[PDB]
Symmetry: C3
Subunit: 123 residues, 3 copies
């Protein structure tokens, strides 16, 4: 429960996230058309891989999530970090393609990656 | 069972799908060589992400799939939609890179995404 | 256990793998800068998809992994194949982008893909 509770919710978000944004980018791509080209391309793949390792990591301490400890918060903020980070980006075809923005997204993937990873594993 | 039954099968397909097609594209890429360049590149990533969110969504109502309701059919046709959709595409390096074809694939990802997602979640 | 044991470990590796390598490439990309451009781009996506289907396949005989038979070894060497394969590659922006190296990585994905896939499925 506590467990299912966690994963679905994060992912659902995550997947409302990645979902609007995917078809959406598709939809805008053709609609914009071009700068928006990479913009859209761009959203997909950073995010697609935000998710891609989200998926690795979440999905797994998922079904290996024994300890009672509260860790979902990061499942939760890493989402929270990464969304506003893309969203912050968020149209500049010029590099920078990054910023404090992703010092948030990636780097939280990193922190919440790092701890929780190690956590349900070594236990 | 009913459950395992579902996921493996869809994925197996899905993964026979994504699998021939991956090494295959590799194999053809070098063999064609060039137009086939993006063609192959092309197959991977639409499909790679067909799968990528397949994976998100399937995999999860997977292990959160309680209701008796018949929903696998779409696991099943969204595959059925997406394969023939790429396959329909399926060599034009000119945009369009889409069509009624993906009005099928993506959009079923969308429908079968949308309902089943919400379904085992809100329950 | 035996099961959890398996998946986490492979993935952890896999995910220490894909993880250093992702932020890392990011980090080097900006730092190199350019040839390193595709190099880094390059690492991500072969590997990102090494993982991408790893994820499909591992993750699933994962929770459908009944037989006692020893199959983790490949979870294990396919990792072992693929790492040293990228790593072998591993800076040439000239094609070849492949070699005996990936005759290892991909092709083990293939062998260990192929058998274990079929195995916990048909059972
Ligand atoms: C609950 C907390 C108690 C107190 C709350 C009070 C907090 C109030 C914060 C007030 C802030 C004051 C504003 C100064 C900021 C100026 C920033 C700036 O100049 O831009 C930098 C710019 C710099 O831009 P740039 O010029 O480098 O590039 C832009 C791109 N070009 C140039 C191509 C156009 O960086 C960004 O754009 C980042 C975007 C920030 C987006 C912020 C929106 C998200 C905020 C989330 C939190 C909000 C509440 C959610 C709560 C939900 C509740 C559960
Ligand atoms: C943008 C900036 C960068 C962002 C990148 C990523 C984010 C980086 C995160 C960094 C780590 C932050 C550290 C916080 C934790 C440190 C505190 C600590 O250790 O104290 C002990 C811990 C543990 O609790 P305790 O140990 O004090 O309690 C003792 C009770 N016994 C021993 C009997 C069990 O305290 C907490 O952290 C509690 C925090 C709870 C969070 C607040 C919400 C609780 C309510 C739940 C529902 C609320 C709705 C929210 C839903 C959100 C919807 C979107
Ligand atoms: C069981 C049902 C009862 C009745 C079955 C009877 C159904 C019989 C349907 C007969 C159809 C009549 C044909 C008219 C169609 C003409 C289409 C056309 O012109 O092409 C559009 C074209 C338009 O092309 P275009 O010109 O825009 O671009 C092509 C690309 N260039 C130009 C670069 C070369 O679009 C497509 O290519 C789509 C490809 C369609 C592929 C169809 C094969 C898959 C069909 C799956 C179902 C088959 C059975 C599976 C059953 C399994 C059983 C469990
Ligand atoms: C290319 C075009 C776009 C494609 C994109 C994606 C596809 C879009 C899908 C859109 C939705 C379609 C709606 C269909 C459902 C609506 C019907 C409905 O609501 O009625 C009630 C529902 C529910 O059943 P019921 O409620 O009528 O039964 C009552 C019994 N009690 C109450 C006691 C439990 O009926 C059905 O849908 C039954 C359909 C079953 C499907 C037919 C096959 C059954 C046999 C199984 C094995 C067959 C082998 C197949 C293997 C395939 C291999 C590849
Ligand atoms: C335990 C076993 C018992 C015996 C152990 C004894 C084994 C000892 C093997 C000794 C080998 C002798 C060396 C001859 C090889 C020459 C290769 C060559 O020329 O390069 C080809 C080259 C050809 O290069 P190229 O010229 O086509 O392209 C390079 C790119 N450019 C040109 C752009 C610069 O291919 C490679 O680079 C492949 C890289 C190989 C990397 C090997 C390191 C990994 C080895 C893993 C095993 C090690 C132990 C791990 C054990 C862990 C324990 C649990
Ligand atoms: C770079 C080159 C390409 C690489 C690409 C991918 C790799 C390709 C792999 C190809 C397949 C290789 C075939 C090997 C198996 C064939 C042998 C066989 O069938 O015999 C019967 C099998 C089965 O056992 P058995 O059937 O003989 O035992 C009988 C006992 N009863 C019947 C009662 C149950 O034997 C084995 O394979 C045992 C091998 C075990 C592996 C050795 C290690 C065991 C110790 C565990 C801990 C060690 C630490 C290691 C951790 C690693 C850390 C990173
Ligand atoms: N889908 C591609 C995305 C590659 C990409 O956008 N690369 C960015 C940096 S990654 C960027 C980022 N960062 O650099 O901080 C971090 C990040 N993350 O942490 O997730 C996401 C990034 N992004 O822009 O997508 C870049 O500078 N490309 C060179 C160019 O445009 O010429 C991949 O997987 O490799
Ligand atoms: N792997 C890349 C694929 C990007 C791509 O092929 N973009 C297509 C549209 S996506 C296309 C699609 N569509 O547009 O309808 C929908 C789709 N889907 O629903 O899955 C898949 C698409 N595709 O061609 O792969 C395009 O028009 N690119 C600009 C160009 O070639 O210059 C990514 O993840 O962003
Ligand atoms: N992320 C891209 C990666 C595409 C890519 O690097 N393509 C390589 C071949 S794939 C290569 C490979 N191989 O060809 O043997 C196999 C492999 N694998 O088995 O995983 C990985 C490869 N790689 O270089 O990433 C290529 O030759 N591109 C054309 C060009 O650079 O102009 C995708 O998913 O399509
Ligand atoms: C329960 C899991 C939620 C699944 C949503 C999948 C959306 C995919 C985003 C790409
Ligand atoms: C919900 C996530 C929204 C992501 C918006 C990303 C903005 C793109 C910036 C490039
Ligand atoms: C049981 C799951 C089936 C796994 C097949 C994986 C194939 C990967 C396709 C890329
Ligand atoms: C099994 C799926 C086959 C996919 C074929 C895709 C055709 C590519 C069109 C571009
Ligand atoms: C237990 C599973 C291990 C999760 C590590 C995820 C790292 C992601 C790599 C991209
Ligand atoms: C741990 C995996 C390390 C991968 C190194 C890949 C080298 C890139 C070659 C291109």
């Amino acid at each position: 429960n506590e467990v299912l509770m966690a994963f679905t919710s994060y992912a659902t978000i995550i997947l409302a996230k990645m979902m609007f944004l995917s078809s959406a980018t598709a939809f805008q791509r053709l609609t914009n058309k071009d700068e928006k080209v990479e913009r859209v391309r761009r959203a997909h793949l950073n995010d697609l891989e935000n998710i891609v390792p989200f998926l690795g990591i979440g999905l797994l301490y998922s079904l290996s999530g024994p300890d009672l400890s509260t860790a979902l918060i990061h499942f939760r903020i890493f989402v929270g970090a990464r969304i506003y980070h893309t969203i912050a980006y968020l149209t500049p075809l010029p590099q920078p393609n990054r910023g404090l923005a992703f010092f948030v997204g990636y780097g939280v993937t990193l922190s919440m990656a790092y701890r929780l990873l190690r956590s349900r594993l070594y236990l």
